[PDB]
Write a structure and sequence with these properties.
The structure is a homodimer. The first copy, chain A, is an alpha+beta fold and about 450 residues long. Chain A has 15 helices and 20 strands. In chain A, the strands form 5 sheets. In chain A, strands 13-12-9-10-11-14-19-17 form an 8-stranded antiparallel β-sheet, with helices on both faces. Chain A has a 5-stranded parallel β-sheet with strand order 3-2-1-4-5. Chain A has a 3-stranded antiparallel β-sheet with strand order 7-6-8. The complex binds adenosine-5'-diphosphate (2 copies), chloride ion (4 copies), cesium ion (2 copies), magnesium ion (2 copies) and sodium ion (4 copies). The site of one chloride ion has 7 residues of chain A, from loops. Chains A, B: Keywords: ATP-binding, Biotin, Fatty acid biosynthesis, Fatty acid metabolism, Ligase, Lipid biosynthesis, Lipid metabolism, Magnesium, Manganese, Metal-binding, Nucleotide-binding.
């Protein structure tokens, strides 16, 4: 066990990490921007270090300051959570070169899987099925560019190799739009990711977003913890996540799961990670790996009994995996609704003061949030303000519970997506299950 | 199913009733004092009626106003929750005489079991074991009074027949103290309950407080849902409740459980109710029946899978019991900690403004409360401000979870018993389990 860790994050994930540390008897160090001084996770941590002013670049992305916090507190490890620096290889290597355990994969693995182009190359080599595409970056030869398109079949999607969070993606319907679409994706990617490498991928018109949770100890053992369906999306971002994926058979789970576990071993993967697939006409197609814990980790926890953050900590401590593959069982069903305060016109976090707040309760209802009545939501970070996760003995029970939980939830003073979430739960097509990644945008007329 | 009900209560129980109504598709009517206008349960109810000013006598105990609220909204039933008028037979008969279903026992049953003297008489007649005692009210014949004492054995306790909430009770160690102890209990009882009938009971020096949950449909069917141990007490009031009772065997459960189920039938009991026993040297001794839902109902729900409030509503609707005795199973363990804001000098609710509030989360952790950051706690009602209930696969897991949950809980600005609760969870004697009703007072030096 690690004696003391720095939690290099904020919000729900910092709260979840702190909870896991407490159960394992790990001393905690909270870093915060000056704006997050009074957040729940800061109050509850054993020690706190202010790591800079409000802007993320100055604080939560401030690598030297985070390392300093670790050194002055004498921590032995740093948990990056998700977002921020969690998939920053430079951060990972600095942490480890400064004599700290990085609670995540090796830096080289973050680089390998962090470049989406190279991630696909490694996956193909490993025997993991991928989306037909350019299999390498796109040049300026518009003849080979249109030929790749013909070989894979329109529509196609232009994707930023350094891309993330849904940004740096453009669909192309025909030859006529290809050249300019490639051009403004590169421009979009330069501006957002400081990397204008793009590739081409077949645009799948009827897939579900089905992702595989893995854990690997980096000592040769790797397991899959069933799957999640995250097909309810807007602007390529997830709104609702569930586990298990509706209608996925033990056969399909095992098929793709064992290929992911083998890929982990081939790449020397360490820690928690997720292989994201598009699933269409009975076939899985790898799109990317998230080399980190994910927002929606609790739905997997609910259906498997496996606390993924606890397992991150045991792995980081050097323990081999405490769970064998055949010990992983799927029981019941879980649904997560992300609660966001996003400006609907700009897609940016919506600042404001919460004037009235009440969290839902009851059996099978889990709420995770740093917000409280009188909280001022800052514009500096992301738009998620809470996570609502309901368990049921089956999917119908889980959805019904979620709907009731959402109607118990009170958040006044700021704009939220609570009303949208209730409408999704009441959606007949969602209730039947297996709706594809394109459904919500069409429903909403986007 | 009932179309619409009035929730004649406030706080946690009103929230729990509203939740149950929602799941069953029952329209809800919240009554409130003028002081409770913005409480969570008022906000969430379909309709709201202000039933009077802040003082309970003027509002929550205001029988005509509560009935009026039912008539103007066209409700078909009234749920009294616990406390207040829930064991007021006058209220029960007025509700039913005005053409509404009272969600509870028949008025005559409330009277029968509401007079503790007559409750004991009926229990003995029914074959339920009771504490040796005077078996009738105490007169002024101090010779027969000391003779009863000799027959049962000192120490003895003088108990108000109309008593409740821990008040109107006095221990007597010898003949020398008997006459005056009887005198000031009667006086205490006149002042508090407007009834100075007292009886004598053997004062049990090593019992656990073990109570049996029942449900009865009033159509001849009655089941017991295991037991709760509520031995952690101060001034005769419960601080911690758990289920099942540690070390109670299937044999002991069945023994006392079947006697309670038979008593229900003999008295024509209807709805949820609890038989409270003292358990000493392997023997159960009835002390009283609570003819209503209890605060600690969720620990039973957690270990049995039975939602007791849902079952109250189905029974009130005229449905026979939806559960057979052999279908009742005990799985895992649950512990509840009452969170109180009580003045430690006067034993009265402590008013104040909550300056910072954060509820605990995580697996197996349930929080029930109407409080929020910026809430002003009124002095008008009771001192409980929330209920924290943790589940575990066994008792050690449940206690460990509770301890962690209590340390995650933040309530600033007002005095609470959170620190006491943490200390109880850390108490080696509690951790071994089976501590008696006298333990906490001795621990605290009271
Ligand atoms: N080839 C594709 N066809 C159709 N939709 C896609 C494709 N690639 C990505 N998407 C959509 O964009 C989402 C995010 O894609 P991903 O590659 O994981 O980007 P990011 O790195 O921004 O998360 C997917 O869940 C899917 O809905
Ligand atoms: N005969 C007794 N011997 C010892 N303790 C008792 C006895 N009767 C009551 N008590 C204590 O007082 C508590 C409440 O008693 P009860 O009769 O249920 O009164 P109330 O109606 O106020 O709840 C019991 O849980 C027990 O701890
Ligand atoms: Cl992570
Ligand atoms: Cl569908
Ligand atoms: Cl009740
Ligand atoms: Cl003990
Ligand atoms: Cs990636
Ligand atoms: Cs009683
Ligand atoms: Mg992705
Ligand atoms: Mg009692
Ligand atoms: Na924000
Ligand atoms: Na609401
Ligand atoms: Na109060
Ligand atoms: Na605390």
């Amino acid at each position: 066990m690690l004696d003391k860790i720095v939690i290099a994050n904020r919000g729900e994930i910092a709260l979840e990490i702190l909870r896991a540390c407490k159960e394992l008897g790990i001393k905690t160090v909270a870093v915060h921007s000056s704006a997050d001084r009074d957040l729940k996770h800061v109050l509850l941590a054993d020690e706190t270090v202010c790591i800079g002013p409000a802007p993320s670049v100055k604080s939560y992305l401030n690598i030297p300051a985070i390392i300093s916090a670790a050194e002055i507190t004498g921590a032995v490890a740093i948990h990056p959570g998700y977002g921020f620096l969690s998939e920053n290889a430079n951060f990972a290597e600095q942490v480890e070169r400064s004599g700290f355990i990085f609670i995540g994969p090796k830096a080289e693995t973050i680089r390998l899987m962090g470049d989406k182009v190279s991630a696909i190359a490694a996956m193909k080599k490993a025997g993991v099925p991928c989306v037909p595409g350019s299999d390498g970056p796109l040049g300026d030869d518009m003849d080979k560019n249109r030929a790749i398109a013909k070989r894979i079949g329109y529509p196609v999607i232009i994707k930023a190799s350094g891309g993330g969070g849904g940004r740096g993606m453009r669909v192309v319907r025909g030859d006529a739009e290809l050249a300019q679409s490639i051009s403004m994706t590169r421009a979009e990617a330069k501006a957002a990711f400081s990397n204008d490498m793009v590739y081409m991928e077949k645009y799948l018109e009827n897939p579900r977003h089905v992702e595989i949770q893995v854990l690997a100890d980096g000592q040769g053992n790797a397991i899959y913890l069933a799957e999640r369906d995250c097909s309810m999306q807007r602007r390529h971002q997830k709104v609702v996540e569930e586990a298990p994926a509706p209608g996925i058979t033990p056969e399909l789970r095992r098929y793709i799961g064992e290929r992911c576990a083998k890929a982990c071993v081939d790449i020397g993967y360490r820690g928690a990670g997720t292989f994201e697939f598009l699933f269409e006409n009975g076939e899985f197609y790898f799109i990317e790996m998230n080399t980190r814990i994910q927002v929606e980790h609790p739905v997997t926890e609910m259906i498997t009994g496996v606390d993924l953050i606890k397992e991150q900590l045991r792995i980081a401590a050097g323990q081999p995996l405490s769970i064998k593959q055949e010990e992983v069982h799927v029981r019941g069903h879980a649904v997560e609704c992300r609660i966001n305060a996003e400006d609907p016109n700009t897609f940016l976090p919506s600042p404001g003061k919460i004037t009235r707040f009440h969290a839902p309760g009851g059996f099978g209802v889990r709420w995770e949030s740093h917000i409280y009545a009188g909280y001022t939501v800052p514009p500096y970070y992301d738009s998620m303000i809470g996570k609502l996760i309901c368990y049921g003995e089956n999917r119908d029970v889980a959805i019904a519970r979620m709907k009731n939980a959402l109607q118990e939830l009170i958040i006044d003073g700021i704009k939220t997506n609570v009303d949208l979430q209730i409408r999704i739960m009441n959606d007949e097509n969602f209730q039947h299950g297996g709706t594809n990644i394109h459904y919500l945008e069409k429903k909403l007329g986007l």
